[PDB]
């Protein structure tokens, strides 16, 4: 593939994009700063401006940058940290349409995106900002950046964001859960893997007594889901999953207890959030199912 | 006038509007909740729903209510406090187009509004929310509510908001300042009053050594203005004033020192913010003037 080609365009492109920013002085974000999109010409020779390269000519589209500065800021992501782990350390591909990549240090993921979505996102931002500034504990994905790359005619949109499941805490059981059932078992291929990413039925089968939760924790979660749903609902959004990482242990995640009885650090985050019908009540439905499902079956009190 | 008539429609209308709310349980505010507007029919007989009255038939339009609940919440305004001081204590008129009214307890003001404006406002809200959640120390007006009343054919839009200058701290000198000069002297009529509301030139005349400020305070203000301007700018907004209340003293305001040398508690807030051209650069201009003017002439460091 022209993949390594892209991997570069990213690290070349962002480093510029962001350093570019740390010139311009800080300022609050405005309803404008969302719609904006900046481009940068990256020739294989390279101006005294866009230099370097020998990799394959492109332009680097940076999106709503002042907004994403704000978001990083609020998610506590120092630019040098961001630039480093992302740009000065080789990017590593992944099996899963939509191609993922990962930071050498397992902190950051990179989905690609249907232009359909990328545009939706832009529109979401204000809505995002609001939820973010209100449900401080939201489960929604932490969107650190949005960028497009132009490879000849071709165009690649990508989003950068928090890996929910770092190598650090090693995950034993791993589930992608929706509250639905059609094809909601992990493919033969998938099950032939490490701590492979399961699914509703596999959970339901392999874990029918549930994930037990100390009342108070069960609430924080419950309410904070019910909040995230109500957002997503409102944005006519569907197919989202709760990604869950259980870790039996023989500190930056959730405390649980077992069907047997072992203590547990669990890790979650709602995902795949950009496909938006944007029927009349259908998302409103998918939210309630997702809700009842996680907050009744997948996690339970006492 | 049919004024006392209106005074009622308000207190009758809000009390319903808000109690109406304290049923529905709390929830984060969504980009939707801004656009919404609820109405309530208030007959002079009155349903078992909208009852009471003998005052003159009307409807009570309540605006973006979940947003304004949020705002009150964030400005720390407990509904019982709000309802009481506003609805269970006679409203008091005022001289100043645009009719003001005041809470018996001097906490709240009520401007009326050109439909032109009221609509602008709605649009501002998201923008408002952002600034509010970012410049915690903004000088912008604290908008507690927006309501319209329908008196026969007639329609009255009103906004409720923080009185910047309560009876509590008695204000000695009082200025309305813009950074302009045309008609920027206080009318003969006006000067024949208590601590009458002056203006640029009167300030410039009666106070040419300025309002002195302990470095650190001068900054908090300076930066926080420069922020508010940049918002307002962005909303293509003009004719705003800085309302200033100086109090010589022989604690909820700003510390200053004098041309002579007396200690001072000063009180400010940007106002008259809804008239929006919404020329190319003109607001951007009016902001910089307003800026330089307050942060150079009206307040100065050391
Ligand atoms: N933030 C994350 N942290 C950890 N793993 C993730 C994350 N995002 C995606 N993944 C992995 O990718 C899988 C699902 O991909 P997803 O994000 O749903 O996008 P997609 O390619 O559109 N899949 P779908 O559209 O549901 O078929 C998850 O089950 C995870 O195993
Ligand atoms: N929040 C407030 N606190 C104290 N006084 C206020 C407040 N708002 C308005 N006033 C008084 O009303 C005066 C100006 O009215 P303003 O709010 O500018 O609306 P307006 O009627 O549109 N005037 P303008 O449009 O500038 O001619 C101020 O100078 C104050 O004396
Ligand atoms: O997908 Se695209 O933007 O048409 O190349
Ligand atoms: O593959 Se599916 O039907 O979205 O779970
Ligand atoms: O001012 Se209005 O709304 O036309 O009565
Ligand atoms: O009356 Se004026 O010209 O707006 O200060
Ligand atoms: Mn998907
Ligand atoms: Mn005005």
PDB file of C-alpha atoms in Angstrom, chain A residues 26-32 34 70 124 126-131 133-135 227 230-231 234-235, chain B residues 26-32 34 70 124 126-131 133-135 227 230-231 234-235:
ATOM      1  CA  UNK A  26      -3.987  31.508  23.603  1.00  0.00           C
ATOM      2  CA  UNK A  27      -7.537  32.724  23.414  1.00  0.00           C
ATOM      3  CA  UNK A  28     -10.975  31.376  24.228  1.00  0.00           C
ATOM      4  CA  UNK A  29     -12.699  29.345  21.589  1.00  0.00           C
ATOM      5  CA  UNK A  30     -15.482  30.855  19.564  1.00  0.00           C
ATOM      6  CA  UNK A  31     -18.383  29.443  17.648  1.00  0.00           C
ATOM      7  CA  UNK A  32     -16.441  30.389  14.555  1.00  0.00           C
ATOM      8  CA  UNK A  34     -15.314  25.175  14.849  1.00  0.00           C
ATOM      9  CA  UNK A  70      -9.060  23.628  23.681  1.00  0.00           C
ATOM     10  CA  UNK A 124     -21.225  17.996  16.580  1.00  0.00           C
ATOM     11  CA  UNK A 126     -20.472  22.741  19.636  1.00  0.00           C
ATOM     12  CA  UNK A 127     -22.667  19.980  21.024  1.00  0.00           C
ATOM     13  CA  UNK A 128     -19.566  18.137  22.108  1.00  0.00           C
ATOM     14  CA  UNK A 129     -18.206  21.200  23.855  1.00  0.00           C
ATOM     15  CA  UNK A 130     -21.403  21.527  25.818  1.00  0.00           C
ATOM     16  CA  UNK A 131     -21.510  17.920  27.080  1.00  0.00           C
ATOM     17  CA  UNK A 133     -18.276  21.217  29.922  1.00  0.00           C
ATOM     18  CA  UNK A 134     -21.156  19.583  31.803  1.00  0.00           C
ATOM     19  CA  UNK A 135     -20.600  15.854  32.135  1.00  0.00           C
ATOM     20  CA  UNK A 227     -26.296  11.453  30.073  1.00  0.00           C
ATOM     21  CA  UNK A 230     -29.289  11.624  25.891  1.00  0.00           C
ATOM     22  CA  UNK A 231     -26.656  13.618  23.994  1.00  0.00           C
ATOM     23  CA  UNK A 234     -30.255  14.197  20.343  1.00  0.00           C
ATOM     24  CA  UNK A 235     -27.733  14.017  17.516  1.00  0.00           C
TER      25      UNK A 235
ATOM     26  CA  UNK B  26     -32.528  18.081  35.992  1.00  0.00           C
ATOM     27  CA  UNK B  27     -30.599  17.260  32.873  1.00  0.00           C
ATOM     28  CA  UNK B  28     -27.716  18.743  30.927  1.00  0.00           C
ATOM     29  CA  UNK B  29     -28.526  21.390  28.398  1.00  0.00           C
ATOM     30  CA  UNK B  30     -28.532  20.560  24.732  1.00  0.00           C
ATOM     31  CA  UNK B  31     -28.108  22.575  21.596  1.00  0.00           C
ATOM     32  CA  UNK B  32     -31.812  22.057  21.096  1.00  0.00           C
ATOM     33  CA  UNK B  34     -31.791  26.992  23.143  1.00  0.00           C
ATOM     34  CA  UNK B  70     -28.602  26.240  33.573  1.00  0.00           C
ATOM     35  CA  UNK B 124     -26.122  34.230  20.918  1.00  0.00           C
ATOM     36  CA  UNK B 126     -24.640  28.941  22.420  1.00  0.00           C
ATOM     37  CA  UNK B 127     -21.945  31.580  22.054  1.00  0.00           C
ATOM     38  CA  UNK B 128     -22.839  32.886  25.472  1.00  0.00           C
ATOM     39  CA  UNK B 129     -22.598  29.433  26.991  1.00  0.00           C
ATOM     40  CA  UNK B 130     -19.122  29.038  25.596  1.00  0.00           C
ATOM     41  CA  UNK B 131     -17.733  32.333  26.949  1.00  0.00           C
ATOM     42  CA  UNK B 133     -17.815  28.269  30.538  1.00  0.00           C
ATOM     43  CA  UNK B 134     -14.416  29.776  29.715  1.00  0.00           C
ATOM     44  CA  UNK B 135     -14.151  33.306  31.057  1.00  0.00           C
ATOM     45  CA  UNK B 227     -11.839  38.530  26.217  1.00  0.00           C
ATOM     46  CA  UNK B 230     -13.277  39.438  21.361  1.00  0.00           C
ATOM     47  CA  UNK B 231     -16.569  37.604  21.912  1.00  0.00           C
ATOM     48  CA  UNK B 234     -17.257  38.069  16.820  1.00  0.00           C
ATOM     49  CA  UNK B 235     -21.005  38.547  17.145  1.00  0.00           C
TER      50      UNK B 235
END
